[PDB]
Amino acid sequence: LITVKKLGSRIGAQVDGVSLGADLDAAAVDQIRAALLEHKVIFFRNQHHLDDQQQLQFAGLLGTPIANRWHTDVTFAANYPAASILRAVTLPNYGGSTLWANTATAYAELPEPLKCLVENLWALHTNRPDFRTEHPVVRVHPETGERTLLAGDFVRGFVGLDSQESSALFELLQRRITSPENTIRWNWESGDVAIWDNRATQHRAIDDYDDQHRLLHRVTLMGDVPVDVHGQRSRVISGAPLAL
Ligand SMILES: [Fe+3]
């Protein structure tokens, strides 16, 4: 049987009883998707048999295949990724942990007046190609229906606010998003695989292994354009949608 074990109150679960690969049946893939959606980042250990080809084939069962600051992946693009699948290949003798934050509970826990603020706030995300996107700060997750905060390192400013103002509000939101109660810090061991939902998380790499060799292999799944709580979609200012 497949088993899903919660690692903290708001984020993180370990999934036992699964050997990741091309051949997982439909019910197994359903359970994995359900766990990803609920726990936001999930971990499979002792996947020692896995290689790049099997990682990629497995990724295809969940979707269509496409660092030291807290971010949501590629949010300078309008249709930024849904999820990634990350496999440990070679790990340092110490350090090298990874952080994830749950941007759904971050929203849900907001005081009412801050909910009113964020539900009508928009942020310019950029990559400095010249990618510039105005995203809503509250996105309605397209599979769970959950309201989630959309911010992170690619934010250059909030639309209609001065830069001191934007900074103050950005830091306030980030501090709630990245609070210890809202995050999980994972210690990687050989054979580990993490899968996170990029539509309800941020993550952050940690520079605590003194530049020892560290390699992980990532496959990313296509996502869609955010919708705010009134049904408005993100606006492309510069660039074009990710395509494959
Ligand atoms: Fe990233």
How is the chain classified by DSSP, letter by letter? --EEEE-SSSS-EEEES---STT--HHHHHHHHHHHHHHSEEEE---TT--HHHHHHHHHHHS-B---S-B-TTTTSTT--SEEEEEEEE--SS---EEEEEHHHHHHTS-HHHHHHHHT-EEEEE-----EEEEESEEE-TTT--EEE--STTEEEETTS-HHHHHHHHHHHHHHHT-GGGEEEE---TT-EEEEETTSEEEEE---STT---EEEEEEE-----B-TTSPBPEEEES-----
Residue 91, domain CATH? 3.60.130.10
Q: Is 113 exposed, middle or buried (0-12, 13-18, 19+ CB in 10 A)?
A: exposed
Asked if residue 73 belongs to a known ligand binding site, the reply is yes
Selected catalytic residue, list 71, 135, 147, 199: 71
In the reported structure, the alpha carbon of residue 14 is separated from the centroid of ligand 1 by a whole-number distance in angstroms of 21
Contact 141, 38 (CB under 8 A): no
* Structure determined by: X-ray
Ion ligand 1: residues, CB within 5 A, are: 73
224 annotated among ligand-binding-site residues: no
Is 218 in the active site?
Answer: yes
Nominal resolution (angstroms): 2.0
Split into its structural domains, the chain has a count of 1
Domain span holding position 228? 1-244
